[PDB]
Amino acid sequence: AFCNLRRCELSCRSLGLLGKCIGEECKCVPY
């Protein structure tokens, strides 16, 4: 599915990660 990525990606990008959608919720990893 898609994710509520407006929660994660604008907080994960500062470490040089991306916000990745894990079916229906976000985790973060580079890159």
Curated annotation (Swiss-Prot):
Disulfide bonds: C3-C21, C8-C26, C12-C28
Entry keywords, A to Z: Amidation, Calcium-activated potassium channel impairing toxin, Disulfide bond, Ion channel impairing toxin, Neurotoxin, Potassium channel impairing toxin, Secreted, Toxin
PROSITE patterns, per database record: SCORP_SHORT_TOXIN
Chain spans, region [R/K]XCQ motif: 6-9
One cellular component term from this protein's GO annotations in UniProt: extracellular region
Keyword Transmembrane attributed: no
Tissue: Expressed by the venom gland.
SUPFAM superfamilies linked to this entry: Scorpion toxin-like
Record has Transport as a keyword: no
Subcellular location: Secreted
Consequence the record notes for mutating R13A: 1.45-fold decrease in cell death of Jurkat cells
A molecular-function term among this protein's GO annotations: potassium channel regulator activity
Main function: Blocks small conductance calcium-activated potassium channels. Shows activity on KCa2.2/KCNN2 (IC(50)=0.0243 nM), KCa2.3/KCNN3 (IC(50)=1.7 nM), and KCa2.1/KCNN1 (IC(50)=42 nM). Induces cell death when tested on human T lymphoblastic leukemia Jurkat E6.1 and human breast cancer MDA-MB-231 cell lines which constituvely express KCa2.2/KCNN2, but not on human peripheral blood lymphocytes (which do not express KCa2.2/KCNN2).
Similarity annotation: Belongs to the short scorpion toxin superfamily. Potassium channel inhibitor family. Alpha-KTx 05 subfamily.
Domain notes: Has the structural arrangement of an alpha-helix connected to a beta-sheet by disulfide bonds (CSalpha/beta).
Extra remark: Negative results: does not show inhibition on KCa3.1/KCNN4 at concentrations up to 50 nM.
Protein name: Potassium channel toxin alpha-KTx 5.4
Organism of origin: Hottentotta tamulus
Lineage, uppermost ranks: Eukaryota, Metazoa, Ecdysozoa, Arthropoda, Chelicerata
